[PDB]
Design a protein around this ligand. Structure first.
Ligand SMILES: Cc1cc(C(=O)Nc2ccncc2)c(C)o1
Lengths: 13, 351
């Protein structure tokens, strides 16, 4: 199981 | 050896020609980087939202005077609130106005108003690699290799200019009318002569050194290329979990498992890109990008023919005419409201 839709960038981990 | 005399001399001459190209490319970049409001909002009719992100949305627009279609990225200045948000938006504009390469989206205008920043790019109508990949499942190795070769050349170009890209993923790779790639979204791109320290990117694509809060270099882009090739060929990325923290734990572990249908050549390339140890990661060694370009998995790749766009693409998107949005997904639409008061004027003076 994992993320199948569009993935957003992160500005801070 | 692996190459006979003829092949080895051909490869060397090829290497000198790369050096010559990149030297000219640096001269041209620097002229634009050192010597960079080319429109306003009412010059465009807004048609449809093509995608969304943290600071705003990208819309298909039509220029009223010429009738040309463009993709307009709209960033809400107030939402660009985070410190690293501001600098990153300035990086994106400045880099996009200075680069020139066949697989990089072309920026045509940029401007700002009381509320928003705007970057107006050539419209690439074939859609994102992301939705084609999710629809078909996975690409065959030759198909994945055709796209990967374009990314390798694009990173060779960018890195020669001391630019790191920092957000490779299928969502950011547009397919043009000839089936070739255009890289978009330079929101994390940066000029870095040595190391940099910002914790940014997309979880599934982050190199371990980013996650571990270590200063890092352009090798993070080569790690990300490994993730991209894996995802193109498998249909899912190598470090795959529902929550970012679980993703980060898998990335740092140093363990990757491959589908049984991956060729051994592909697995070998991927083990050398998805290498936690920076003293061993391809792209980061004494032979630089040539460790990748000369790998067996790329043996059938004619690098110059890819650059010159002479290779038949594996997939040509359907196109019904100018302004066709059939290859993009739908998004909620919201009216662009421009405040009567200037917001964040001092913070964006340079934009
Ligand atoms: C969410 C998003 C979409 C895009 C983006 O540039 N698309 C795009 C689509 C078609 N033609 C050109 C560009 C960005 C930066 O973010």
């Amino acid at each position: 199981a994992g993320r199948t839709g569009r993935r957003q960038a992160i500005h801070d981990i | 050896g692996h190459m006979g005399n003829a092949a080895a001399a051909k490869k060397g001459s090829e290497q000198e020609s790369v050096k010559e190209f990149l030297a000219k490319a640096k001269e041209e970049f620097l002229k634009k980087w050192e010597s960079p409001n080319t429109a306003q909002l009412d010059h465009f009719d807004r048609i449809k939202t093509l995608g969304t992100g943290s600071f705003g949305r990208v819309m298909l627009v039509k220029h009223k005077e010429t009738g040309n279609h463009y993709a307009m990225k709209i960033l809400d200045k107030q939402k660009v609130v985070k410190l690293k948000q501001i600098e990153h938006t300035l990086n994106e504009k400045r880099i996009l106005q200075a680069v020139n390469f066949p697989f990089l989206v072309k920026l045509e205008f940029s401007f700002k108003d009381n509320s928003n920043l705007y970057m107006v790019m050539e419209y690439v109508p074939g859609g994102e690699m992301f939705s084609h990949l999710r629809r078909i499942g996975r690409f065959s190795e030759p198909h994945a290799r055709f796209y990967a070769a374009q990314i390798v050349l694009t990173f060779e170009y960018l890195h020669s200019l001391d630019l790191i890209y920092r957000d490779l993923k299928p969502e950011n790779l547009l397919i043009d009318q000839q089936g070739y790639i255009q890289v978009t979204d330079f929101g994390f791109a940066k000029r870095v002569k040595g190391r940099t320290w910002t914790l940014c990117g997309t979880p599934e694509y982050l190199a371990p050194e980013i996650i571990l809060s270590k200063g890092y270099n352009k090798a993070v882009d080569w790690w990300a290329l490994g993730v991209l090739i894996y995802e193109m060929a498998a249909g899912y990325p190598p470090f795959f979990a529902d929550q970012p923290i679980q993703i980060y734990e898998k990335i740092v572990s140093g363990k990757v498992r491959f589908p049984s249908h991956f060729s051994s050549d592909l697995k070998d390339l991927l083990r050398n890109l998805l290498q936690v140890d920076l003293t061993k990661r391809f792209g980061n060694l004494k032979n630089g990008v040539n460790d990748i370009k000369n790998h067996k998995w790329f043996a059938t790749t004619d690098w110059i023919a890819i650059y010159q766009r002479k290779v038949e693409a594996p997939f040509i998107p359907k196109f019904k005419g100018p302004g066709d949005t059939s290859n993009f997904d739908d998004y909620e639409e919201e009216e662009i409201r421009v405040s009567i008061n200037e917001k964040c004027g001092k913070e964006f003076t340079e934009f």
